[PDB]
Design a protein around this ligand. Structure first.
Ligand SMILES: *Cc1cc2c(cc1C)nc1c(=O)[nH]c(=O)nc-1n2C[C@H](O)[C@H](O)[C@H](O)COP(=O)(O)OP(=O)(O)OC[C@H]1O[C@@H](n2cnc3c(N)ncnc32)[C@H](O)[C@@H]1O
Ligand SMILES: NC(=O)c1ccc(OC(F)(F)F)cc1NC(=O)Nc1cc(Cl)cc(Cl)c1
Length: 461
């Protein structure tokens, strides 16, 4: 059903990622038509003498070759129009809607499909929609909704997985749960997601998108932490909570609180009051509230608009040495002094520095995802890009990232890397901890004994 390609453009694409650093080339690119084709190719790798590497590629948004299969085969999971798509379904047993999507589908295409078929949409997002479903579900998938709905791995009912033995398995909390929870946040280690059954809600029509400035980090974090505790026994709450660190030019640094209030035709009459009520309880700098009103799709697609402006300036295809950390809330204050003011004090081509807290209880502890041992933790995202055609810019950013990691290590901050870029066995053991490493290695022994899948992650050999 599927086809092997040796087209130089296909090989070049499969040999690179958004990070722009790791460049391991495969022998060929496989374009599947359906799940059985993926099963066939993985089956052949498993049965082969050498046991060649097989990695699925979503949209290639990896930072450090996580989707590369050195001298093996990259499965181009991007099918898209040609194949039939499942319509959203309502279930009286689940008390809501779901949709079956191909593992290679992009979230932007999923959104467009569910909106045009019942005005439905997933409840938990990423900031960027040009990512595959299989790709984000292999990590966590987080944005401003995760504090309330949990990550995208907490909003999936079932999967079809092609294991490292080329077997197709349907799994959920009730059927083959070890494979289901193993795959979720599993870094592609136990199989290729060919189908994901995504939870849906009735989509809002519009968004009231707010930004407010803070000079005091203690007031900023206290407000972020109070906002993510809202929504217990009904109660007024924002639908999205993010934040970012800003340089004063163009205190020494400012913190931007970013919130949204989702609304439709029924709630349009109470949106202005709900926003004013929630904002009154906050301690942002007076006269720094910036408001926008726009369609739900336009809000969710905001980062794609930033991308088009970057492509127009030749600033998109540059190295992206992006570092993502999960920081226990008990150590966030020290993080500001030492990193935002310390390491970063005094940015290459520039880029955002995201910061926002999440609730651990919205993350299922049975999944493979690694979070800090604290109820409240922050994502701290260093999304700074190198200058185009300037290798020294990438080196300076890489030294800054190592200084941030050294700062966390040296002060005993129990931070965990999100999209971990570890490569040494002792680094992976430390990342997971004894209990989780033991569950991870056992799942690997069972579902990918020859370590065929997602070898670019550099965990097993
Ligand atoms: C580039 C980027 C990434 C990004 C983002 C914005 C941009 C500009 N915003 C994010 C956000 O707000 N929140 C978040 O949680 N992540 C965000 N990211 C990072 C993104 O999630 C990751 O890059 C992730 O890898 C998904 O991207 P993509 O779909 O392109 O996947 P990949 O890089 O090719 O593959 C990643 C790993 O997973 C394995 N893989 C790929 N597809 C599958 C399937 N179907 N089944 C199993 N494993 C799969 C790859 O082999 C690799 O190990
Ligand atoms: N405001 C944003 O949100 C954003 C803006 C610009 C942008 O720069 C780009 F235009 F170049 F794309 C990227 C953004 N956001 C993310 O990229 N978010 C993210 C990325 C990873 Cl790798 C992990 C996690 Cl958790 C979040």
């Amino acid at each position: 059903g599927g086809r092997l390609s040796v087209d130089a453009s296909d090989i070049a694409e499969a040999s690179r990622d958004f990070g722009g650093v790791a460049r391991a080339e495969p022998m060929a690119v496989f374009h599947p038509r359906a799940a059985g084709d993926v099963a066939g190719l993985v089956g052949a790798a498993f049965r082969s003498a050498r046991g060649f590497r097989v990695s699925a590629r979503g949209h290639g948004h990896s930072i450090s070759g996580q989707a590369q299969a050195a001298g093996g085969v990259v499965v181009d999971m991007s099918r898209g129009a040609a194949v039939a798509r499942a319509l959203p379904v309502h279930s009286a047993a689940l008390g809501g809607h779901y949709v079956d999507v191909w593992g290679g589908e992009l979230w932007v295409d999923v959104l467009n499909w569910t909106l045009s078929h019942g005005g439905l949409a997933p409840r938990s997002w990423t900031d960027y929609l040009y990512l595959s479903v299989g790709g984000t579900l292999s990590n966590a998938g987080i944005s401003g909704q995760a504090f309330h709905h949990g990550p995208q791995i907490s909003n999936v009912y079932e999967l079809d997985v092609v294991t490292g033995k080329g077997e197709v398995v349907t799994c959920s909390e009730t059927e083959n749960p070890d494979l289901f929870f193993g795959v979720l946040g599993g870094l592609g280690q136990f199989g290729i997601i060919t189908r994901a059954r995504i939870a849906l809600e009735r989509a809002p029509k519009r968004v009231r998108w707010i930004r407010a400035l803070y000079s005091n980090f203690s007031e900023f974090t206290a407000d972020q932490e109070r906002l993510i505790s809202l929504g217990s026994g009904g109660g007024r709450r924002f639908d999205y909570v993010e934040g970012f660190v800003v340089a004063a030019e163009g205190s020494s640094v400012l913190y931007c609180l970013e919130v949204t209030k989702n609304y439709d035709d029924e709630t349009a009459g109470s949106v202005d009051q709900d926003v004013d009520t929630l904002l009154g309880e906050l301690n942002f700098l007076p006269g720094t509230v910036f408001t926008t009103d726009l369609p739900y799709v336009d809000f969710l697609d905001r980062v794609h608009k930033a991308e088009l402006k970057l492509r127009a300036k030749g600033m998109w295809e540059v190295p992206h040495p992006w570092l993502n950390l999960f920081v226990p809330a008990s150590r966030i204050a020290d993080f500001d002094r030492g990193v935002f003011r310390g390491v970063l004090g005094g940015a290459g081509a520039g880029g955002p520095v995201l910061i926002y807290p999440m609730n651990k209880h919205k993350w299922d502890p049975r999944s493979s995802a690694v979070t800090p041992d604290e109820e409240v933790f922050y994502l701290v995202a260093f999304l700074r890009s190198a200058l185009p055609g300037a290798p020294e810019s990438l080196e300076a950013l890489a030294r800054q990232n190592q200084r941030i990691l050294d700062f966390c290590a040296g002060t005993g901050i129990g931070a965990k890397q999100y999209l971990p870029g570890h490569k040494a066995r002792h680094e992976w053991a430390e990342h997971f901890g004894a209990a989780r490493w033991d569950r991870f290695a056992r799942l690997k022994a069972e579902f990918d004994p020859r370590a065929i899948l997602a070898a670019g992650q550099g965990i097993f050999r």
